[PDB]
Every structure is written in structure tokens, then in C-alpha cells.
Amino acid sequence: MVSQETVAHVKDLIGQKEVFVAAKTYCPYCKATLSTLFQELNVPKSKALVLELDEMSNGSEIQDALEEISGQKTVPNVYINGKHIGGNSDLETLKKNGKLAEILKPVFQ
């Protein structure tokens, strides 16, 4: 599957920035999620780490580690403040809930 070291490293990647997105290119909802965060909600890009897994030689193991970490198998896979948000549908739910703006409030502080 994936090693504990890969899992740790991917967790480390996740917690480096206020907003983490594991995405792929040619991924409609990855684009949606990135646009929501960065264009609609003006999340500072300097406060985000966006990985494009299919642009990375280790993208596949990162994805497996992400699944080991959350059980989520799909991209985009969003963490905010090191905590799992989920995919685009979750993000949209939180966006609509108003909960996302609360969740993001620190990213702007």
C-alpha cells in the first residue's frame, strides 16, 4: 500500500500551509475547488499548497497516502488548517453553509 513514512510526509505536506489541495490537471471539480478558494473566496495563494498529483512522479503514492489518511480516493482533496475538508462537494456544502468562511477566517487574520 503506502509506507508509514509516505503517510507522514503527506501529512506533513498537508499541514505546511493553511490551505492544502491535492488536485489533478483536467479535473473539473479540482478547477472548481481551486476557483472557489482562490478566486471566489480570495484565499491567499501564499497560504496554500496545491499539489497537482499527475504532474508529480510521486503523485500516485501521494494519492494513496491521502486515501490511507482520509479514506478519500477522489481529487480534489482539501485540507484547511491541517484538517480534512474533503472534495469539491464538501467544499461547496461548507461554502453554502457559510461554514467555509468561518473555517477560512484565520487564513485572513
UniProtKB/Swiss-Prot annotation:
Keywords: Cytoplasm, Disulfide bond, Electron transport, Glutathionylation, Mitochondrion, Oxidoreductase, Phosphoprotein, Redox-active center, Transferase, Transit peptide, Transport
Signal peptide annotation: none
The species this protein was found in: Saccharomyces cerevisiae (strain ATCC 204508 / S288c) (Baker's yeast)
Domain Glutaredoxin, first and last residues per copy: 7-109
Protein name: Glutaredoxin-2
Residues carrying Phosphoserine: S3, S57
Enzyme Commission number: 1.11.1.9, 2.5.1.18
Family label: Belongs to the glutaredoxin family.
